[PDB]
Amino acid sequence: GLYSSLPPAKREEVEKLLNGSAGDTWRHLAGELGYQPEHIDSFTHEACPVRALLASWATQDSATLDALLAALRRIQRADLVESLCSESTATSPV
Amino acid sequence: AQKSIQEIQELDKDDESLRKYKEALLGRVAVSADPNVPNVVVTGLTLVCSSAPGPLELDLTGDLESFKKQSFVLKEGVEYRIKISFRVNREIVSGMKYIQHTYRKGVKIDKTDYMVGSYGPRAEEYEFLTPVEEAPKGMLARGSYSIKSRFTDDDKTDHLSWEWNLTIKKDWKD
């Protein structure tokens, strides 16, 4: 699945919940995504770089859910993964 | 005459071009004052947390069914506050009450209700902040807590009600 497959409210919640997570949680993700160290110094200077990171990552096909989840496991964020996976899975009982 | 005074009456063409921008107003005669819109709605919720690195918020007035899945980020045993923001574009309402429940692993344990008071038909939005609230602890208690939120008044009229999840994480700041 692609990150583009999620609803608009999920994409907003990924940002809004990460503002409560550590000011450098995104910094761990970027290192495991293989982003260059100079780009990390440009992002930490912004007020809300975590929002821009999702938009800059979504510029490429590498922005799959399976890849985002895999990278979150390397940085010991499997806690936050499971809670966002509540929408990011086949579930609609109505 | 018909073709001599237009040499000075040209200023009319510089303000007549702006009449096309007035025509767009006719496309949206709703004024948010039609009976198809409610009296009072929570514009969003915000989580003010002096222990956190940054403030938290969530948008409202939309797809409340989505919030049953998406969650927040808190810390084990931390202190937090809940700020609720609502607009009032209709009439004065009184005895307004915000209700907040807490569900652990799909089981309610308790709920608390906080009186907001009375508010009038201001074009802007009012905010209410709760007292200090503690968080749960232990790796098993790091699961998603459902919070149910309700708004009612002395007239028994439900304004909006929603519900949202809450990840209790081990860290959120280092």
From Swiss-Prot, chain A:
Post-translational modification: N- and O-glycosylated.
Stated consequence of mutating residue 10 to A: Decreased interaction with ARHGDIA
Regions of this protein lying in the Cytoplasmic compartment: 1-94
Organism domain of life: Eukaryota
Localization per Swiss-Prot or TrEMBL: Cell membrane; Cytoplasm; Perikaryon; Cell projection, Growth cone
Domain Death: 11-88
Subunit structure: Homodimer; disulfide-linked. Heterodimer with SORCS2. The extracellular domains of the heterodimer bind NGF. The cytoplasmic region of the heterodimer binds TRIO. NGF binding mediates dissociation of TRIO from the receptor complex. Interacts with RTN4R. Interacts with TRAF2, TRAF4, TRAF6, PTPN13 and RANBP9. Interacts through TRAF6 with SQSTM1 which bridges NGFR to NTRK1. Interacts with BEX1. Interacts with BEX3. Interacts with KIDINS220 and NTRK1. Can form a ternary complex with NTRK1 and KIDINS220 and this complex is affected by the expression levels of KIDINS220.
Domain notes: The death domain mediates interaction with RANBP9. It also mediates interaction with ARHGDIA and RIPK2. The extracellular domain is responsible for interaction with NTRK1.
Function: Low affinity receptor which can bind to NGF, BDNF, NTF3, and NTF4. Forms a heterodimeric receptor with SORCS2 that binds the precursor forms of NGF, BDNF and NTF3 with high affinity, and has much lower affinity for mature NGF and BDNF. Plays an important role in differentiation and survival of specific neuronal populations during development. Can mediate cell survival as well as cell death of neural cells. Plays a role in the inactivation of RHOA.
Name of the protein in its database record: Tumor necrosis factor receptor superfamily member 16
UniProt gene name: NGFR
Residues of the full protein shown: 334 to 427 of 427
Curated annotation (Swiss-Prot), chain B:
GO biological process terms, semicolon-separated: negative regulation of apoptotic process; regulation of protein localization; regulation of Rho protein signal transduction; regulation of synaptic vesicle cycle; Rho protein signal transduction; semaphorin-plexin signaling pathway
Coiled coil ranges: none
Record-listed cross-link Glycyl lysine isopeptide (Lys-Gly) (interchain with G-Cter in SUMO2), residues: 108, 111
Modified residues (N6-succinyllysine): 111
Cross-referenced Gene3D superfamilies: Coagulation Factor XIII, subunit A, domain 1
GO MF term list: GTPase activator activity; Rho GDP-dissociation inhibitor activity
Compartments where found: Cytoplasm
Pfam families on file: Rho_GDI
InterPro entries documented for this protein: Ig_E-set, Rho_GDI, RhoGDI_dom_sf
GO cellular component: cytoskeleton; cytosol; extracellular exosome; immunological synapse; membrane; nucleus; Schaffer collateral - CA1 synapse
Glycyl lysine isopeptide (Lys-Gly) (interchain with G-Cter in SUMO1), cross-linked positions: 108, 111
Keywords, in A-Z order: Acetylation, Cytoplasm, Disease variant, GTPase activation, Isopeptide bond, Phosphoprotein, Ubl conjugation
Residues with the Phosphoserine modification: 4, 17
Post-translational modification N6-acetyllysine, affected residues: 13, 75, 97, 111, 148
PANTHER family named among the record's database cross-references: RHO GDP-DISSOCIATION INHIBITOR, RHO GDP-DISSOCIATION INHIBITOR 1
Disease the record associates with this protein: Nephrotic syndrome 8: A form of nephrotic syndrome, a renal disease clinically characterized by progressive renal failure, severe proteinuria, hypoalbuminemia, hyperlipidemia and edema. Kidney biopsies show diffuse mesangial sclerosis, with small glomeruli, hypercellularity, increased extracellular matrix, and contracted/collapsed glomerular tufts surrounded by immature or abnormal podocytes.
Oligomeric form and interacting partners: Monomer. Interacts with FER. Interacts with PLXNB3. Forms a heterodimer with RAC1. Interacts with RHOA, the affinity is increased by three orders of magnitude when RHOA is prenylated. Interacts with PSMD10; the interaction increases ARHGDIA association with RHOA, leading to ARHGDIA-mediated inactivation of RHOA and ROCK and prolonged AKT activation. Interacts with KANK2; the interaction is direct and may regulate the interaction of ARHGDIA with RHOA, RAC1 and CDC42. Interacts with RHOC. Interacts with CDC42. Interacts with NGFR (via death domain); NGFR binding decreases the affinity for RHOA.
Functional description taken from the UniProt entry: Controls Rho proteins homeostasis. Regulates the GDP/GTP exchange reaction of the Rho proteins by inhibiting the dissociation of GDP from them, and the subsequent binding of GTP to them. Retains Rho proteins such as CDC42, RAC1 and RHOA in an inactive cytosolic pool, regulating their stability and protecting them from degradation. Actively involved in the recycling and distribution of activated Rho GTPases in the cell, mediates extraction from membranes of both inactive and activated molecules due its exceptionally high affinity for prenylated forms.
Family the UniProt entry places it in: Belongs to the Rho GDI family.
Protein name stated in the entry: Rho GDP-dissociation inhibitor 1
Organism: Homo sapiens
